[PDB]
Each structure stands twice: as structure tokens, then as C-alpha cells.
Design a protein that fits this description.
This is part of a larger assembly, with six copies of chain A. The first copy, chain A, has twelve helices and seven strands. The first copy, chain A, is an alpha/beta fold and about 325 residues long. The first copy, chain A, folds into two domains: about 200 residues, Rossmann fold (3-Layer(aba) Sandwich), CATH 3.40.50; about 110 residues, Helicase, Ruva Protein, domain 3. In chain A, helix 8 crosses helix 10 and helix 10 packs across helix 11. Chain A is elongated, with a radius of gyration of 25 Å. Chain A starts with a helix and ends in a 5-residue tail after the last helix. Bound molecules: adenosine-5'-diphosphate (5 copies), beryllium trifluoride ion (3 copies) and magnesium ion (4 copies). Chains C, D: It is found in: Endosome membrane. Chains C, D: One of its GO terms (cellular component) is nuclear pore. Chains C, D: This is Vacuolar protein sorting-associated protein 4.
Chain lengths: ~325, ~325, ~325, ~325, ~300, ~300
């Protein structure tokens, strides 16, 4: 009975990934819903008294790579509560009955450590609409999930069941009834893309301006957040390729701060960068040409049919996440 | 053994018969089946036998577990709210011993009532499933549901199921009373809004509740509850939109108003202490915004499958 | 935990197949990307700090038999890291809920032995777009890979997930999102074919020149690397066939026997069975044996699979030279 | 561990069926290729040192009943090495993730006994081009085969994957790349037909000569080796039919009795049940029984699958002749 | 598993009878013959229209050979699990070679596979190829084990399976003497007044039927007297109370039921020609006409 | 899983079905009554299929045959065999035939032969081939006297043709008639206190054309609870004979309040009426579709 809690104690993370609300570019409706879900019942407990109850479940859905796990990291950072990060490897067991006793002990620990947050990434693996799947695991896990979510003699009060999935239409109808907040996280718009570029570039010394970031956001038409992250990564790795595949360096302005340039200048010394020791390194600064080359190299991942499926799911049972 | 100390609840959740909006036939059937053998014990003897099996079904989120909570509140009897988690073990034979001792304790604690939520977790139709944990448990439940001569006085089995066509036909025939819980009508919608608002101050009238129930076309009970929750949370969002606060009348009860007024004290909202914030009142516009936000959680395929099931086994 | 680690301890290869970067011909973009993402964070760790992070996953796709596993062998040789080479037999198990703990313990061992490189050959078998596959094991192993790659409470820093598949359009969209660099490995051009011929012939005694290698590389149009390897193997096997059909031997220059035309100076007419070892002299390689091997062995890949690979490249990939 | 080896120990054959290389008619190129690839690394291992490596997989395709399994029996006879005869029932299992472990254990058992031969009969039943078949079985078994043949951390040196199929155009492109030599086994010609007649007549008493066998081989054009074997068996059973369907008998010259016409020298009428042992003499063979068997049994090969086999040969095939 | 049907109980099918007789009797009775190149037949396909005594002839060979028999069917070698419908065939051939010499009877070989055209490709290919490897293979050495296959549709088989089956014997429609002999063995030991000319006219009338059709019309003509005993009134005491049914109203037509009739005294009426005429006028032929053309074509290119 | 009993159901205990009983009785009872009639190649029926819409008590009729043949009744449900028992089912079908052999004269009753035999083209291996392959072998057990198999089906159209063919004799069990429905009402109320006359019973009979015994049973169970129903829930009440029974507004001595207001055991439950059942008839529709008379009669025409 204690080995179950010892196995489930590895699902409570204590690393606290530093993702703040200013790190998330856009998604103001989802951020406001998560704020009124977690920040308010701990900061202002004198408002949720009587017939006013907080939210008891939020389903984040959308295209792959839009920021659902990033909002989960931001909630785990700024929640100041117990965060349960479970998956299909922490609930399914080899024996018989342990696959439901683990879920019962997980919800018992979540109710014992209230206020607590249960984050189940990829809820479509556990809830497979119980029509054709494996009888034992599917039926028992889904029914125990329903009973531990509301049930009769459980009274789940103060816990939050976060869920992030890419396939929202393959959920069970009872699970979709349990998740009382269907929040659609879409692909980012122009202002969100420009703020995401401003966040991902950071304190790197570059000649880019706000008009340059605006033209970059206008260029990335249909990109996702991971695609913006990898074109920022490619544009940041571009000065390393510039300092690798070039010769005829030149000391600019400091203990020989030498920089690659055109062959033939005021001191175009023909040597290699491997002989250059550290801290006499003046790499070329970022321009718009490196980000244009990163845009030309890296291609968008999300197609234009899954967007139609997510749009049909929003018009069927979904809200908007701005 | 002693592991069944969590199947019975001692909380008694305060859900009375007036809280259950609508469902008059199911309410009166559960009422007679839980009251009349305790009210008039001479009425049930021999031929005129009471109901020993009650099954509830319909769309998901219509009031099955709510009716079970109402029975557990206004029954005055031992409630056995147990599911498939406390019936299956790692060993062999203990999965039958659990059901045997469960029915033994339920017969020893007469008058009792056993409520099995999601009974399809025990009825996998034994196609190619787990033998020792499916078929033997199903036959044990079939021979322990043979209390038409054994448990004439005492226990009563219940059932709540969202998907009732995937159910074993033997236990379906053993459940003699199968009541279909439908989507609520307009009067049930209006009294459900009246119950869910409750003692919260508002300006909503009976005509406002009637047009709210007319706007909710095809909504369910949980959808009505989360619409009421969103309408309750909307004045907190209006306070969070803090601009040009204004004091009303005791001991500095502030209230935000339109930008540009008489006495528009432009300040924040977190600088003020508690118990002096006169919150705005519930209009109909926040309710209409919650209606436009919240979507119905049920589809048309489940409704036609429920219609097929009730026309096949009404 | 310890049983799964004892089962997964036979996945770290300690063989180190000696394939260097000069052995691979062509594929300059794939070479440069693998070179930075393998060599640079373990050689110069002071550069990758702050906003600069290395590549966390590289996918190699193309027609069958182009050099994806050869590039993986070169990475495993020149990586100086704990090279994890898994497939669909080390992860899938018989019991219930034991295939996910295998992947979790694999990624835990990769994080415990960082810097590490995970090479999953034929990723198309594990990931099948989770549309109509076998529900429990398929969807759970896909969601377990998706959680263990980046996830929330994992923070995979230092590991690398290499992929090598022949059919990349059957990959899941989230898995294609995880593989942040799709590198297309195409059919080789004339300089790469000439370099592969010079590498595969190598130190063999032959009279072949640069013009002969250029004509061979111009002749093998549409061929692949395995086809070049087997025509070099057939051209090397042909002197043993000439030794088999070697009537009228001729000892030219400790009695090194050499076949010739029937009837010559010193035409000792015998067979090669009675001739003992450590004195044989094989005939030299000419361009005629290689032309015979080219006329004997056909190419493997056709011209519609290349169209599908180019379609996937222009839709969701980059050109890897 | 013990279960997989106990299940795969039955795949090794030790009976050694005696079929020599002279028992196969024709197929000179296939005979030469199989002869070198099974004999030369076993007999003379000093010829393949470094740059020259033997063949690592041979596909024997063609029409059904052409001598593919007979050629595999000849290789298993004069191989002098370990022979693995696997099929679909020995690799495919009922449990989840058990067939891939069986293929891995099969190749690991074959690598411990180098040199070894793995004769996967009917590779078309285990390779279905990964297009539309069963997801788990198809993708996982084909992926385990593609990884286990060469792979990265395998180093398959000293093995040979012999494959015999009838529909080679329904194979995967990666599997066709894996099989190096795709040798065509075409229909036999006149010389192979006469050689099959000369080896199928055996040592039975007959009056047939070389020109008789040449005329028979000219008459059986459009047939195959199984058809030649069944007309030889039918012509061998025709004198037993003449024994059984006869009433008038005759003792010629310890009672070497033979049937006769009704009315002869000593036309004794009795039965073969009354005929005891060591006294029965069969009638002699002639061209009439062979012509009757040829006119009695019809061929089995059609004329469009031969065109498809010729198309696959012209696309990606060698010549066995 | 041993039936009790000898050679004489099968009517007609002379070529199939002599072929099976030599192929399963010649090695087991004369071991001094099959030496050297003389090998027995290792496969026989018995096709044709259904109901024409194929399993009856298989039981005749199972009786008269005095050897071990295996009488599995198509549904026995088809499972729902993945890769379990081939280990059954492997264990079948293993237990056949364990008790050599043996006879293997496989029914509905057209329904065992699906000629890998449109059905389940994985299961079809694995079943077919495992059947072929268990038939000849490489290290399977099937000597003395006879594969006796029977089917109703031969043209939906595979080229490799029809190559593995050596002698493709056709079971045709029965003839006049076969129909009369089938009537004579189907009527049994019941008290009858039927003659050989009556059997000849019956067999001339039932041209185009099958053996199962002849069996069920003999069963109908045998059940019709005990049907007319029960479904009749106004019985007649002929000649210690021998009662016989007649028309209502006769020379002493006693109207009663069969409940008050004493045991071992009720006169059962003998069956006549009109019962068989009613049976043949009631029963219709079952076979089609294009299947005979398909059998003609199959014999025409695989005679 | 296998029931066994020496039942005591006479022909007269089975309402109606006189036409079906006479043919079935002559087929089975005549053989048993006068066995000397069946020497040689004349052999009694040993398979009989009973088919017709549900709610006709095909089971009850089957027990009557057993009672009248003076045989042990052995019985099994095919639905249970196929689902509940699952694998042990082969063993069960065996043991069943084995018991019956050991206990001649005896009768095997297989109920819902349609829930077992399903044409074997798409069924699962163990239940399909094993369950449907063992029954057939056993019904060939006539050849290896003394036992009879009676199959029961509601949906004969859905009955495996192979199984179908083992049931030489087929007998249609039709829906009930006026006299029988009248008897069913009487039996179903039996001793219960009520004021129904002989004529009321006939009325109830006449008013339930197309109902089955089952239907009538459900309707009667409903009606008998009406006086309890009235006593439990009444707006106003009234003293009689002190016992307060429910009465309409402003009845003689009509005091309105609620059942809750009234003392326990002094509450008067309403008396039983013929009219009240009429209520119950309206709220229970018949079970059996009207196309059944033809579908069953098609079978009587074809295999009767
Ligand atoms: N909306 C966003 N705002 C900020 N960063 C983002 C956003 N979307 C993606 N990213 C960046 O790209 C990564 C991919 O997003 P992630 O949280 O992994 O999405 P997912 O839930 O699909 O797994 C993030 O970790 C972050 O670095
Ligand atoms: N008849 C009803 N009266 C009041 N609220 C109801 C009713 N039916 C549904 N609801 C609302 O919807 C919820 C659904 O009922 P609940 O017992 O939680 O689950 P379920 O109906 O799925 O068993 C209730 O908790 C309540 O908030
Ligand atoms: N690009 C290449 N550069 C050098 N050698 C190559 C190349 N492509 C193929 N080869 C040669 O052909 C063989 C086939 O490549 P391999 O790694 O097996 O490819 P795959 O990934 O398809 O399994 C290599 O082992 C090598 O000998
Ligand atoms: N060239 C040949 N020499 C000798 N026998 C042959 C030859 N070709 C075919 N046969 C005979 O034909 C039969 C078919 O052999 P096999 O290779 O098993 O055909 P397949 O593999 O196509 O089914 C063998 O029994 C063999 O004796
Ligand atoms: N030619 C025949 N000779 C003797 N009996 C026959 C003949 N044809 C059919 N029968 C009888 O008909 C019955 C049914 O035949 P069956 O074995 O079902 O045919 P098949 O073998 O084609 O399935 C058998 O019991 C058999 O006795
Ligand atoms: F890939 Be993410 F979880 F949408
Ligand atoms: F209808 Be509820 F979800 F039980
Ligand atoms: F491209 Be290879 F065959 F993996
Ligand atoms: Mg995510
Ligand atoms: Mg509920
Ligand atoms: Mg590769
Ligand atoms: Mg073969």
C-alpha cells in the first residue's frame, strides 16, 4: 500500500522550469482562463464561497507544436501548488487491479495535497472512446478516471485536471463532458509571431529593429512556435558557420578581437579559427539576412487539413483561445 | 474483509428531492422503491413484490449520479457506492470473495442499497476478454442478483450507464426496471437555472429565466451548471477590469463604473482590503455571453443510439 | 527497474565500426549538420550558452540504399559518446504496460550517460500517424515517445534522436514536429559516384586511372551506393572466375602463376586445383571487368518513389545535397 | 532466452538430404553463383581478405516448380555448413512483440555458428512492400528483417540469406536492395529436359536411347521440372497398371512370370494376389508409355505470368540460364 | 477415428476407386515393388459437384488401408490469433510423420485459402505458404504420408497448390447403375416390395440428382408410411386386432386414434412406388448449370 | 449451467397451443407409448425445433412434453453457453448429452438455438467452431434410442442452416387466444384480493389481442400494485369501515392532506378493480411484431 505512493512520488516534479507569463507570446484568453483557474483560488479565497466554485478541468487542444506544454510549464512555474505530471507509463501496471489502484492513489494524493494540479499530457492515449479498444485496460481505466473525476463519493474540490492533446475528436464523450473548458490553442498571428521572435532572440547583440521583427513576422506566414524557435536557433548558429567557413580575419578595435571579413583588407591575416584561443572572439552580429536564410531553409510542419479538423472541433464543442 | 471500509460513504451529500430538476417518473419510481417498503411494509408480500432492480441510462451528464446522490441523501439507509476498483484483486478467488463478502455485508446491514456506477466496466460481453476477472465475476453477480426469493427484504441494486447497448444481456434481463433519463425540457431548464443561481442576488425575472431556457436548446445539466459558473465568474472579471472605481453608500463599498462619471476615483483593485468591494449585479448579458461561449457537449449520434436502445428495450 | 536495465544493457554498441567522414561521398549538408550537432557541443561547450542551443533531433530520409545507416555509422565512430542503437524489438514487450517503461528507462539511461546519441533505425514502424493502428500498444508507445522527447518534466538536454526511414510520409505529424531538421538523402551525383568508386576499389592493385573512374561514374546513371558496392564486389570477384577458367597457365617472373591465352611461352597446361596457396598472382583490374559488372547488375530504385521523396522534401523538408 | 532457443532449435536440419549438383539440370549461372558463394569462403578463406567480400544474400525467383527448393536442397547437401530452414510458422508468434525477438534470436544463433545459411522460403509471404497490409505484423517483421540483415550494430559476416519466391514484383524496394543477386530461374530448354529425363529414368530397365530422350525432350516443350517428374512417375506406374489390369499370364524361361495377350504359349489365367513374391517380372519400358503420360498430364504454367517474370528480369534481374 | 465403410459401399466412380486403391494399397501390401525410383503418389485432389461421395470415398480409403487417419476440415485450420493457424498445420504434419504411414484428409481446400487476391493477404499468404512448405519443403521429408484433398470448387485454387496435388481426379455426376445401386444401399433392410425394374425406372426418373438427394428421398419414402400411420383416421380391422388405416367409410371403418391401439399388433403398411413418385415430384434438383461447364473446363485443361 | 428436472406440467397446464401440442405429442408421445411400432428402419423423431415469437412459454410446453413422455427434462440456454460459460462450453454440451444418455427416457432442451448457431463464416474460433461443431456431433448421437432434442428459437430465420437441418420436425408456437389470455389473467392474479367477475376476466382477455403470456404477466404485475400506489400517494383521503383511503376532491368525509399526514397501518390501500387493469393494458404495449404470424406461418408452410 506504501509502494504505490513510493512509485507515484516520482510524478511530482520539483525542478520548476522557469517559464513565466511574459515568456508565452499570445494566447491571452487561455492565459486568462488559467489565471482565473489557479491564481485566484489561492490569492483571493474570499470570493469562491457559497454557490461559486472554481474550474475543475481544462482541455487544451490544437495543432502539434502550438504551446500547450509551454502553458503547462508556465502553470507549473507560477502556480505555487503541487503539480502532478503523469502519463500512460505511470498508470498502467503489469498486474491486475494495480492499474486502477494507481489512479485511485494518485487522486487520493491529489486530494490530500490540495490545492494540487494534475496534468495529463496526451489524454487521447488513455481515453479511446471505449468502443473497440482493449477491454480490461480501456474500460477499467476510463471508468476509474470518470469516478475519480466526479463520481459520487469522492468530492473532487480544489484539484485541477489539465489535459493537452493533439487529437480532441478521439476523446470519449464522458471525458469531454468532464472537461468543462475546451480551449483551442491556434497557430500564432502576426503580433504573436513578432513577440515570439523578440523573446527567442533575447539579449544577443544584433542590428535588428522592430520593423525588422515586423517584416520577419510578416514573412513567417503559417509557421508554428517550434518552427519560430528552430529558425531562431538556425539564425543564431549562422555566425558559427560564418566563423567556420571563412578565412582572412581582421582585428577590429582589446587583446586581438579578430573578425572574419572579405579576403583582402587592412590586416587580412590568413589563418584558421581553430588556432584562435578563446576570449579573443568577435563573432559577426545577426542581421536580417541570416533570419531570411533560416526562413528559406526551414519549412512549416503543420498541414492545412488538421487545421480543418480543429476548426470543425471548435465549431462543434470548442471555445476560442485568441 | 476489512478492505471494504471505503465502499460505504458516511458523508451524506445534501442533495434533496427538490434539487433534482425534472425527471418526475424516475424520481417517483426511486421514491416508491426506496420509501414504500420502509413506509408500509405490509403492502409488499407475496405477489405484489417490490422492485429489486433499477437501471438508469441516457446521454452522459443528465442526472444519474445526481439521482443516486439524492437517494443516498433522502433514503435513510446504508449506501454501498462501490465500483470495479474494489472488486478485482491481484490474486485468484479473491475477486469472487470480494463480491461474496460485499453481498454478505449488504444482507447483514439490511435495509441497504447497492449503487454500481458504470456497470459496463463489469460487463465486457465476454467476447475474448479476461476469463477469471470477467466471466466468473459476471456469473457471481448473476447468482447474487438472484435475490428475488432470497433478498425480498433488504438490498436493492442500482445502475448508471452512459452507453447501455454495450451491456450483457443476462444482467440487462435481470435489471427489471430500466428508466431512460432524457435531456431536460423547458420547465426543468428554468428550475435548474433557479436552483443553480440560488441565493445569489440578481435582477433576472421569470421571463428572463424562460428566455434563458428557450436559448438553451439542447443543453444538458452540466452545461447549465458551467454556464451558471461562467455567469458567476463574470463580475470578478469586471472587477479585474479595474478602471474608475466609485464608492456606493456602508464603510466605503466601492464599485467600478463607466470611464467618466461623478466621483470616478481612478485607482487599482488590489490595493483595497477585503469585505468592502460592492460587486456588480448579474444582468442577462453575461448569461448570454456564457451561452455564446459554452457549447453543448452532446452530439446527434448518441441521441439516435439512445432512441434505438429505448425503442429496442423500452 | 533493474530487469529493464538488464534487458536494455545489450543496446549500447561497444564495437565502434571504423567508418570515417571521408568514407562517405557527397551529402555535404547532412555532413555539416551532423558535424555541428555531434562534434560542437562536446568539443566547444562554451559557445552553446544562453540563447544558443544544439539540435535535439535529426531525421534522415530518402530512397532505400543511399547512406543513412552509413552516416549513422560515421556518427557512431566519430561521436565519442554512448551511442544508443535501438529498434522495434528492444522497446516492444509482451506484458501489459511494460513497453512504455522500457522507453522511459532507455531515455533515463541516455540522460544518465549524457552526452549520448539515440539512433532509432526505421522510425516508420513505431509511429504510424495513430489513425487506425492497434490501439493500446501503438498509441501508448507513440505518446510515450512524444512525452520522452521534449515533454514537460523531462528536459532532454544533451541527447540526440537520429532517425532513418525510407517512407517518411507515414510519420506522425507530432513526431515530424519533434524531428526539427528533415534532411533528404538523395541519389548521388557524378563526383560522389567517382569518390565511391575510388573508396570501394581503394588499395587494390589495378591499372584504373582518373579518366576510367570518370567514365565509370558517368556510366552508372541512376545507380545507388549499394549498387556501386555490389558492382565493385563483382569486379573484384571476376579475377577469381578467371583463375577458375585458367587453362594454359604461364609462370611470369618464386613461381607466381598467371593465366593467358591457350598456347603461349611457357604454357603449362594444368588446372588451379593442384596449385597450392601463397604463390598465386591474380590478374589486374581493367575497365572491361567493371563494364561487365555494370552490364550485369541493374539499379534498384525506380522513378516514382523518387517523385514521392521529392514531394515530401518540397512539402516539409530541406535538401541535404 | 531458453524458450526462444528451444523453439528455434527445430529449424536447424541435420538429416542432410542427398541431392548433388549433378541432380539439377541447366541453370549454369545460378549454379556458378551459388557454388562460389557457398564453397569458396568455406574452402579458400584467404582469397577474400579485406577489399573483397563474398555475397551476402541471393534471391532465386521464377515460375513455380522450376527447381528453386531443389537448388536449395543441393546447397544444403554440399554446403558443409549450418543450414537454417525457416518459414512463416516458426517466426510469427501470437504474443505482442514476439516475432521480432524470434528473428533476432534466429540471426544471433546463425552468427554464433559461422558460416551459416538461412533459407527463408517464400519471402513474399513475409514481405508485402509496407503499403496496405497488417500494421503490426507487416511493419514490425519487415523492420526487424531490414535492421537484422545489415543494420548498424550487427556486422553480419559469414551468413547468407537464401530466398525463393514466385511473385518477386510484390516485394519491398528495401528488401530487393537487401538481396544482392536476383537470379532468374527460367523454364528449361531442350538440353535440360533431356538431362532431367536421363536423371529421372534412374537405373530401371528400359530400351530408350539418346535419340529417344532427345525426341522426348523435343515433345515436352512448354513444360517444367515437376511436369517431367510426374510424367516419369506416370510412365513408371504404367507397367504396374499393365500388371494389375491383366488376366492372362505367362511364365517365361525360378518362375519369372509376366503378363501376355489372351492366347499365347502357356496362357495361364490367374491373379497377382495369387502371384507370390520374388517371382513377378514387370513389362519393359518403351516410348509409348512416356508418350501416353505426356498426353495424359497437362502443363500448369500459364503465359502471362511468364511475361511478368520477364519484365521483372529485364528491370532488376540477372540471368541463370 | 475409424469408420466402417468398405470398397463395395460406394456406387460408381471406377477411375477414382482404382486410383485410390492402387495408390494406398500397392505400397502397404507389396513392399517389394516400390524400390529405387518407384515412389507412391503423394497427393490426390478429389473435386467436382458437392455431395457426390467424396468424404464417403475418403472414409472407404480410411477403412481399407489399415493405417492412421486424420480427417480435419477447413474450419479446424482457421484461427483468429495472429500466426496460430499455421502451427496447427505444422503439428498436424508432425503427428502425421510420427505415425507413418498416414493419410491426411483436408476438406474444402478452396475455403482454407482465399487465393491471396482480395481477402486477408497476411493470413492467406501465411496459410498457403505454410501448407506448401509442409507439403514438400526442404527438411520435411514427407515419405509415406499421403495428402488426400477434397473440394467442391477447384477453379478457385492456387497454381502452386494444384502443382502440389499430383492426381487431380474428377468426381462426375452419377450414372444409371450408380443411381440404382445407391437406391439399393439406401433402402436398407426395411420390409419392401420393390423390384429391380422398379429401381431401374426410379433411377431413370431421378437423372440429374445427387447422392445426398437420393439419401433424403429414401429417408422421405421411409418416413412416409409412419407419417401416414399417424396422420390418418377411420382405421380398419383386417383379418387379433390387426388395424390398418383406410378411407373414411369402408367395410368396418373403426374411427379411433393410435393411442388405444395395442403394441405389436398395428399393421404397418408396406412402402410402394407412389411414395417414391411423391418424393421425386416434391424434391427438386439443387445444382446449377454453369458449374458443370466450369467442371468441363477444369477437366479440359487439367485432365 | 445445466438444469435437470422431472417436471410436473400436464398438457392442460399449458394455455392453448392445442394444434402444436397434438402434432408434437403424436411425434414424441406415440413413440414412447407404443415403442414396438418402431422396430427396424422406422425410427422416432429425435430433433424438434419449436419456433415462434417470444413470450409463448416454449419452455413450459417443452416441460409438458417431458411430463407426458415421463422423461427427465435437461435444459440449457445457448445465450449463456455463448457468453457466460465461454470456453467450458464444449465440455458443457458434452456433459449435457452425456447426462441425457445416462437418464433415458429423457429430453434435452436448448433455448435460443439462434444465439448459438450463426452460419460460421465470420464467428470467432472457440465459441463459433467449438460450440456449433460439438452440438452437431452430438445430434449425430441418435445413431451411436432414448433421447430427444427440442430446440427453441424466436428468430428461426437467424438459425444456422446446419443446425436447422438437424431438427427434422419443426413446430410453430403461435401467439395466445381469448380463452388462454383469460386463463392467464386469472392465474397471474391468483389469490390476490380483487373484485373482478368472470365477465371482467373475459373482458381483459378480449382486450389484449396480440399480447403474450409474458406481456400479460407484466400487465398484471403492474395492475396489482395500483391500490398500494393509491394509498402511498393521495392529495385528499377519507375514513371508511379508522382507515383513510384516497378519494377525489370533496368526497363524503373527504379530508385532504397527504399520505405523510396519516398514521401507519390506518392507511387504506385501494381495492382491486377490473377497470384498473385496463389502465395497465394501455401502459404495456405487446412485445411481438405482427409480421410474426406470417414469418412463423411461412415456416409452418415450409418445414411444418
Ligand atoms: N506560444 C508559444 N510561446 C512561446 N514559446 C513557444 C510557443 N509555442 C512554442 N514555443 C516554443 O517552442 C517549443 C514547443 O512548444 P511546446 O510547449 O513543446 O508545445 P507542445 O505542447 O506541442 O509539446 C516550446 O517549448 C517553446 O520553446
Ligand atoms: N436534474 C438535475 N438537477 C440539478 N442539476 C443537475 C441535474 N442533472 C444534471 N445536473 C447538473 O449536471 C451535473 C451532472 O450530474 P452528476 O451527478 O455530476 O453526473 P452524472 O449525471 O453524469 O451522473 C450535476 O452535478 C449538476 O451540476
Ligand atoms: N553516400 C555513401 N557514401 C559512401 N559509401 C556509401 C554511400 N551510400 C552507400 N555506400 C556504401 O554502400 C553501403 C550501403 O549503405 P548503407 O549504410 O547500408 O545504407 P542504408 O542506410 O540503406 O542501410 C554502405 O555500407 C557503403 O559501403
Ligand atoms: N532442374 C531440375 N532438376 C531436377 N529436378 C527438378 C528441376 N526442376 C524441378 N525439379 C523437380 O520439380 C520439383 C519442384 O521443386 P521446387 O523447387 O520445390 O519447386 P518450387 O520451389 O517452385 O515449388 C522438385 O521436386 C524437383 O525434383
Ligand atoms: N457415390 C456415392 N456412393 C455411395 N454413397 C454416396 C455417394 N454419393 C453420396 N453418397 C452418400 O451421401 C451422403 C452425403 O455425402 P457427402 O459425404 O456429404 O458428400 P461430400 O463428400 O461431397 O461432402 C453420404 O453419407 C454418402 O453415404
Ligand atoms: F506537439 Be504539441 F503537444 F501540440
Ligand atoms: F452521465 Be454521467 F457522466 F454519469
Ligand atoms: F536506405 Be537504407 F536501405 F536504410
Ligand atoms: Mg505538448
Ligand atoms: Mg454519473
Ligand atoms: Mg539504413
Ligand atoms: Mg519452393
Amino acid at each position: 500500500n506504501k509502494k504505490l505512493r513510493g512509485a507515484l512520488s516520482s510524478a511530482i516534479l520539483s525542478e520548476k522550469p522557469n517559464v513565466k507569463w511574459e515568456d508565452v507570446a499570445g494566447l491571452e484568453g487561455a492565459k486568462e482562463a488559467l489565471k482565473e483557474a489557479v491564481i485566484l483560488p489561492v490569492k483571493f479565497p474570499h470570493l469562491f464561497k457559497g454557490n461559486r466554485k472554481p474550474t475543475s478541468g481544462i482541455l487544451l487542444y490544437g495543432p502539434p507544436g502550438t504551446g500547450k506544454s509551454y502553458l503547462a510549464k508556465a502553470v507549473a512555474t507560477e502556480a505555487n501548488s503541487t503539480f502532478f505530471s503523469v502519463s500512460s507509463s505511470d498508470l498502467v501496471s503489469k498486474w491486475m487491479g494495480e492499474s486502477e489502484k494507481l489512479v485511485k492513489q494518485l487522486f487520493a494524493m491529489a486530494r490530500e495535497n490540495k490545492p494540487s494540479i494534475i496534468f495529463i499530457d496526451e489524454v487521447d492515449a488513455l481515453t479511446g472512446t471505449r468502443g473497440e479498444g482493449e477491454s480490461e485496460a480501456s474500460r477499467r481505466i476510463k471508468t476509474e478516471l470518470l469516478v475519480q473525476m466526479n463520481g459520487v463519493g469522492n468530492d473532487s474540490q480544489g484539484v485541477l485536471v489539465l489535459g493537452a492533446t493533439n487529437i480532441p475528436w478521439q476523446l470519449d464523450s464522458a471525458i469531454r463532458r468532464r472537461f468543462e473548458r475546451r480551449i483551442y490553442i491556434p497557430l500564432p498571428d502576426l503580433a504573436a509571431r513578432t513577440t515570439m521572435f523578440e523573446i527567442n532572440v533575447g539579449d544577443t547583440p544584433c542590428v535588428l529593429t522592430k520593423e525588422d521583427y515586423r517584416t520577419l513576422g510578416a514573412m513567417t506566414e503559417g509557421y508554428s512556435g517550434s518552427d519560430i524557435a528552430v529558425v531562431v536557433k538556425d539564425a543564431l548558429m549562422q555566425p558559427i558557420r560564418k566563423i567556420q567557413s571563412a578565412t582572412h580575419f581582421k582585428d577590429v578595435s582589446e587583446t586581438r578581437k579578430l573578425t572574419p571579413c572579405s579576403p583582402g583588407d587592412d590586416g587580412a591575416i590568413e589563418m584558421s579559427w581553430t588556432d584562435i584561443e578563446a576570449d579573443e572572439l568577435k563573432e559577426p552580429d545577426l542581421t536580417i539576412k541570416d533570419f531570411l536564410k533560416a526562413i528559406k531553409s526551414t519549412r512549416p510542419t503543420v498541414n492545412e487539413d488538421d487545421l480543418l479538423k480543429q476548426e470543425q472541433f471548435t465549431r462543434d464543442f470548442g471555445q476560442e483561445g485568441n
